[PDB]
Amino acid sequence: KPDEQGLQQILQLLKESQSPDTTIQRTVQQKLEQLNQYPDFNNYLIFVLTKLKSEDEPTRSLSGLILKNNVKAHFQNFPNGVTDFIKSECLNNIGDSSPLIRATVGILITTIASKGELQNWPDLLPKLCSLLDSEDYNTCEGAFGALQKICEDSAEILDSDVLDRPLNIMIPKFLQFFKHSSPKIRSHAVACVNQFIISRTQALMLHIDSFIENLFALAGDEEPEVRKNVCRALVMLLEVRMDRLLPHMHNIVEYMLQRTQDQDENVALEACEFWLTLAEQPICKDVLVRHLPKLIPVLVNGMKYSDIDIILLKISDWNLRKCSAAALDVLANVYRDELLPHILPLLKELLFHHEWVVKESGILVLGAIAEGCMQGMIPYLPELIPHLIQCLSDKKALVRSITCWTLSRYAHWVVSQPPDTYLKPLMTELLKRILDSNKRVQEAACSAFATLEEEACTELVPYLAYILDTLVFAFSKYQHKNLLILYDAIGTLADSVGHHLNKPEYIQMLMPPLIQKWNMLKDEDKDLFPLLECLSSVATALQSGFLPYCEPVYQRCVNLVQKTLAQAMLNNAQPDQYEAPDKDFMIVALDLLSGLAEGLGGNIEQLVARSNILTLMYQCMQDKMPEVRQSSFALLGDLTKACFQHVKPCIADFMPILGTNLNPEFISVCNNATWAIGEISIQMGIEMQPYIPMVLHQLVEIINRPNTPKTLLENTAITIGRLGYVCPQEVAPMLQQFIRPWCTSLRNIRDNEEKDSAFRGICTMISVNPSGVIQDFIFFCDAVASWINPKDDLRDMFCKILHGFKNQVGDENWRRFSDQFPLPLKERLAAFYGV
Note the helical H segments in 320-372: 320-335, 340-351, 356-368
Whose CA is closest to 483, among 513, 457, 463, 453?
Answer: 513
Distance CA 148, CA 140 (A): 12
Closest residue by Cα to residue 60 from 111, 17, 118 = 17
Contact in structure between 38 and 82 (CB atoms under 8 Å): yes
Max CA distance (Å), the chain? 122
* Cα–Cα distance measured from residue 594 to residue 540, given in angstroms and rounded to the nearest whole number: 10
- Rg (C-alpha) for the chain, rounded Å, is 36
* Closest to 676 in 3D by CA, of 686, 665, 691, 697: 691
Q: Helices 464-477 and 504-518 meet at what angle, rounded to 10?
A: 20
Handedness of CA 408, 410, 411, 412 (dihedral sign): positive
> Phi/psi of residue 591, each to 5°?
-65, -40
Helical H runs in 600-734? Answer: 605-609, 613-622, 626-647, 651-660, 667-684, 692-703, 710-726, 728-731
Q: How many CA atoms lie within 13 A of 683 on its CB side?
A: 21
DSSP states of 125-145 as a string? Answer: HHHHHHHTT-SSHHHHHHHHH
Nearest CA-CA partner of 276 in 231, 229, 325: 325
Q: How many residues does the chain have?
A: 835
**What's the one-letter identity of residue 644?**
F
Experimental method for this entry? Answer: X-ray
How many whole angstroms separate alpha carbon 70 and alpha carbon 35?
9
Q: Give how many domains the chain has, as a whole number.
A: 1
**Cα 164 from Cα 405, distance rounded (Å):** 56
Quick check: 400 and 370 in contact, CB under 8 A? Answer: no
User: Nearest 5°: phi and psi at 372?
Assistant: -70, -50
CATH number at 188 reads: 1.25.10.10
| Cα angle 558, 559, 560; round to 5 | 90
- The 8 Å CB, 24+ separation contacts for 558-567 are 558/589, 558/593, 558/611, 558/612, 558/613, 558/616, 560/523, 560/585, 560/586, 560/589, 561/586, 561/589, 561/590, 561/593, 561/613, 561/616, 561/620, 562/612, 562/616, 563/523, 564/589, 565/616, 565/619, 565/620
Contacts 24+ apart (CB under 8 A), 252-260: 253/287, 253/288, 253/291, 254/291, 255/219, 256/231, 257/291, 257/294, 257/295, 257/298, 259/227, 259/231, 260/298, 260/299, 260/302
The answer to whether the beta carbons of residues 748 and 786 sit under 8 Å apart is yes
Separation between Cα atoms, residue 716 and residue 696, nearest integer Å: 10
> Is 170 within 8 Å of 203 (Cβ atoms)?
yes
343 φ/ψ angles, rounded to the nearest 5 degrees: -110, -45
Could you tell me the residue range of the domain that residue 825 belongs to? 1-835
The DSSP annotation for 9-51 comes to: HHHHHHHHT-S-SSHHHHHHHHHHS--SSSHHHHHHIIIII-S
C-alpha distances (whole Å) from 526 to each of 286, 479, 481, 521, 532 are 46, 13, 10, 9, 11
Kindly state the DSSP code that residue 687 receives in the 8-state scheme: G
Integer Cα distance of 304 and 324 in angstroms: 10
